[PDB]
C-alpha cells in the first residue's frame, strides 16, 4: 500500500520527520539498519557527503574519522552505476579493514538503491540489516516498490536540504548569462564570444561577473562547472 | 511476469527491434502512442536530441521542423525533474499554439518517465492516448512496472546508441587524468596544480593534453567539462 506514503511525505518539513520516516520505512520491510546518503556536487574538488543513518554512534562517529567514503564500495556503485546493489559484508575483497570493521556492527545484509535528484545530487537509500541475505524470492516481492520509494524519498529529501547543502540551487541565471557559459563551457575566451554572440568584449564580461556572485564562484571555469553540475545549463 | 521483456531486451541488437518493444508495451498498458527521446550532453552548446515514436507523421515532422524541442514542457520537466509526470494537454496555460496542435493529432493523456543513466544520458519514456484521462487507480496499477521497463530501457538504448551519439563514452581516464581535470574544473592553472599535488608542472600539462586528445577537445576547458558530463570526474 504505497498510496498512504505520497501523502506523508507531501507534509514533512523537517529533517527529524525524515529521520523518523526512513527509520519506519526501514523496519516495516524486514531491516534494522537504514543510510540515506547524499553526495552534493559541492565542492567540485572533494565532495561533501551528508547522511541520516539510525547506525550504532560508535559507526556514526567512526566512519567520519577515517573518510570511510573513498574506500566505501557501495558509494563508488552509487556514483558510477544507475542499477540497485545487492551485497553481503563479507563478499568483498579489497579493503579488509573497513569491512572487517563493518560486520562488527551489525552492517552485513543490505541492498543500497542509487537514484539522481535536482541539483546535481547523487543520493542512495540503503537498508541493512544483521541476518537473512537477501535471496531473489524476497527481492521481487519488494523490488518495484522499493526503487519508487527511493526516487519519493530523495525528492522530498531534496527540497528539505538543498538550501543547506547546495545554496547555489536557488540561483536564477538570466537569458543573456545562461549563454554566456554555454560558451565558456566549451573554452571561448571573450573576444571569442563577442563574435559569435555579435557584442561588445565588456558586455560579454558584464554577465559572467554577475553569474559568479550568484553562483558564489571565484572565476568563471568554476562558475560554469557550478552552473552545469545544478541543471542551469541544460 | 517480466521475465520475457528481461529476455527480450538482452536481444535486442539493433534500433528496429527497440521500436517494436516499446510499441508492445505501449498497447499492453492501454495506449496509442509512445516516445522514447534520449538526449546526449554534446555538444555542450546544442545538445542533440535522439527520438522514436510513433506519432501521427505530421506531428513528427513538425515537431523537429519548428523545434518544439526547446518549448515543449514536457522535455523541460525531463530535464528539470527526476520524478513522473501526468499531464492532459487540455490544462496547459501558455504554449497554446504547441498544445493545441497535439490535441489536434490526439496527444491529450500523457505518462512520461524521466531516467537517467550512463555517459550523461538522459532519457525519458512517454506513453499517451486521446481519450480516457489517466485516474489514479490506473497509475497505482502500472506506475511501478513502467518505472522498471523506463529503467531497463535506457539501459538497452544506451549500449545500442552510445558509441554513436557520445563518441567520448568509450573514453577511459587515468587516475592522474582526472584529477588534473578536478583541479582544472576550478579555475586552477598549471603551476597551481603542480604544487597542490607536489609534483613537476610539465607532467600536470602532460595529462592535460592527453585527456584533451582522448576526450577530443581543443582546449583543456572544453575537454573538463565533456569528462564532466560524462561521469568520468565523480
Ligand atoms: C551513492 C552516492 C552517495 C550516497 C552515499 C551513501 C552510501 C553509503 C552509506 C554511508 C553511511 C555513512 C553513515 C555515517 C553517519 C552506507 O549506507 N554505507 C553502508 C555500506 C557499508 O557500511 C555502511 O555503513
Ligand atoms: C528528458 C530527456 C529528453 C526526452 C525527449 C523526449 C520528450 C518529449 C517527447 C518528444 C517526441 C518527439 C517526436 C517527434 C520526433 C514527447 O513525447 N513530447 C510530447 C509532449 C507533448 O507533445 C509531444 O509531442
Avoid at 523537517?14 to 520491510?29: A, K, M, P, R
Avoid at 574519522?65 to 563478499?91: C, K, M, Q
Avoid at 563493518?102 to 543500497?112: E, Q, V
Wanted: hydrophobic share 40%; proline share 4%.
Amino acid at each position: 500500500e504505497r498510496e498512504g506514503y505520497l501523502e506523508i511525505l507531501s507534509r514533512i518539513t523537517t529533517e527529524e520527520e525524515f529521520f523518523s520516516l526512513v527509520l519506519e520505512i526501514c523496519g516495516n520491510y524486514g531491516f534494522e539498519f537504514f543510510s540515506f546518503g547524499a553526495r552534493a556536487p559541492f565542492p567540485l574538488t572533494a565532495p561533501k557527503y551528508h547522511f541520516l543513518s539510525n547506525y550504532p554512534g560508535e559507526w556514526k562517529s567512526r566512519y567520519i574519522s577515517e573518510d570511510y567514503t573513498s574506500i566505501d564500495p557501495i558509494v563508488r556503485h552509487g556514483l558510477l552505476e544507475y542499477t540497485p546493489l545487492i551485497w553481503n559484508g563479507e563478499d568483498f575483497q579489497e579493503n579488509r579493514f573497513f569491512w572487517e570493521e563493518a560486520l562488527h556492527h551489525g552492517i552485513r545484509h543490505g541492498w543500497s538503491i542509487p537514484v539522481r535528484g535536482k541539483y546535481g545530487l547523487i543520493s542512495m537509500l540503503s537498508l541493512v540489516r544483521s541476518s537473512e541475505s537477501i535471496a531473489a524470492t524476497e527481492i521481487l516481492e519488494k523490488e518495484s516498490f522499493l526503487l519508487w520509494i527511493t526516487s519519493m524519498l530523495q525528492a522530498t529529501f531534496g527540497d528539505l536540504l538543498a538550501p543547506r547543502i547546495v545554496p547555489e540551487s536557488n540561483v536564477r541565471l538570466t537569458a543573456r548569462e545562461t549563454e554566456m557559459l554555454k560558451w565558456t563551457a566549451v573554452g571561448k575566451t571573450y573576444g571569442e564570444i563577442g563574435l559569435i554572440l555579435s557584442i561588445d568584449q565588456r558586455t560579454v564580461k558584464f554577465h559572467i561577473v554577475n553569474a559568479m556572485r550568484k553562483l558564489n564562484s571565484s572565476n568563471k571555469a568554476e562558475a560554469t562547472m557550478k552552473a552545469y553540475a545544478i541543471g542551469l545549463l541544460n
